[PDB]
Symmetry: D2
Subunit: 183 residues, 4 copies
């Protein structure tokens, strides 16, 4: 939880720097009562700005004083039925992003089924780790300076971070689909 995580992390950092409620309260310009309260799990109303100041006085970051994402698994597993997929369209029309399962235990995991609706290579716009798999059709991949390659169904690829790239269905083939797993 947020307030409880903050309460346990605040106390930890406080002592880590040899301060007692009195000492931190003084640097902060608050009462030992207040600091004691926060550490009792009563800081949920503290604002971003107030938190930044606390983080500054303790010489660390807000992230260091806040709990991790949390657990949303059921005995280590999380499942998503195709009916629950949130959808985002890249209108210009061009791409449809069908978001697959995600988890707070691995925040960087952003998997998707990307429908590639355009089959005009020249109409590809560079975006800028990721694993991909051609689900259906033929994909025309372009990367680097805004190289390319034509990939058949079943081909897989890895694109390193910061690598600008664009996807389009093979010219004339109409459309294509791919699984993109960002991680």
């Amino acid at each position: 939880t947020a307030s409880t995580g903050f309460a346990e992390l605040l106390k930890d950092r406080r002592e880590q720097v040899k301060m007692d409620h009195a000492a931190l309260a003084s640097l902060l310009g608050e009462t030992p009562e207040t600091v004691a309260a926060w550490e009792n799990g009563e800081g949920g109303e503290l604002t971003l700005t107030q938190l930044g100041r606390i983080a500054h006085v303790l010489g660390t970051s807000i992230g260091a004083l806040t709990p991790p994402a949390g657990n949303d698994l059921d005995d280590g597993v999380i499942i998503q039925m195709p009916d629950e997929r949130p959808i985002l369209k890249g209108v210009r029309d061009y791409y449809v992003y069908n978001c697959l399962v995600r988890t707070k235990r691995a925040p960087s995991l952003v998997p998707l089924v990307v429908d590639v609706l355009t089959d005009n290579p020249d109409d590809a716009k560079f975006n800028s780790n990721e694993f991909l798999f051609v689900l259906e059709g033929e994909i025309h991949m372009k990367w680097g300076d805004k190289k390319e390659a034509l990939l058949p169904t079943g081909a897989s690829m890895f694109v390193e971070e910061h690598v600008p790239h664009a996807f389009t269905a093979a010219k004339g083939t109409g459309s294509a689909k791919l699984i993109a797993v960002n991680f």
Copy 2:
């Protein structure tokens, strides 16, 4: 800046999970305009609880949406003169805090004044820690082991290890330089 840093990282994350303003807004019970306000540096009054909810909806943590500690160095250096040391009591023990930096938050160095020379009254307490015997003779205890450490002796203590120091029996007091990192 906290508010500034959040605006940028919030935009990055929301975009990362393929969420438009409306979607995020819908899940939070807010307006798409309010989200755009946040991503514009106007999230300063957001409460810890709210940030947590925003983080939860974006499947990540508050730390992921907040900026790093910051930079308080002068071309890579930060210096502390002996007069600036904050002094904290261990009422027993006196902690004279040495230089610290937001670029290495875990660095907590100190000159510890060890005021008691009676091991029998030693009290155990307590990441990694490096120690150096600055003055006197230190009686050290740990485990649940002991050792007499003369001036100039150095030691390393791993995280979670209970230990205690006192000046050698009848020596009055001693000083340690402790570097927690």
Copy 3:
């Protein structure tokens, strides 16, 4: 290069711990010339045991003294055509390995052919793993829990979690795309 990488990192570490050739040599029972040979790219014949001793004397690990996996990317990209997939048997299970890279060693993706449609004969096995039901209906088990997953369903399984799949009872077989990272 392994030999090249080692030469450089060996020099860096030895210097880091304030050791001259002679000192290192003394502790290893070698000559100062032999060490200079190593730091010159001539450590190719050193045995695993020896590297470990060198590492030990330098108070670090063999990994600290050896180069990273390397770079097999083409301007950040690596591609695998369906014909290049190595195929491995799970004799039951067929593992068609997809693209891998030395720049992300933990990435082990596959298309798994699930050949049995009898949950009773399911066998449990097994970092993080993302899965997608490519074809058919998958019967999944884990914990010590079950679930019927239709085509297009996606799942995430955390490290150390025992689980097993089989095609739905009487469906013959199914296919999964599994991404271990």
Copy 4:
């Protein structure tokens, strides 16, 4: 241990990539017997070059197939008496490095007592995280483009990684000493 660590890490990576002794042996051009042996703790004689090839085939690094530094603590502690300090002189004469305690459980920890024998600032040569404390005398610190500051006994400082810097005793004071803790 090295051979045993390698045996447990090799097997781990092997299976991690779905291979059996036969499969890896084939890619490697060796017998399942040999690979089985290595995994039985019999690979201590493998050379650096041979290891690199194994690491290459398994698509990872030698470090990923080798055990961590190891444990050299006594119930979490390691002590060094001033008599055991290894010494290195920076002759040009100029500096004496009295190495303090080190540990395989924190390899980056390199503490030292540095005797600054020169008191001619102009004779300071830039070296290029670290915490420092002036033990004795006055130190003249220079950093950045090959800024400066005069630090009295008891002052402490933090120097970030890659920051080129040079130390010298205050001009005319003769010599000085400092504790330098690299980490």
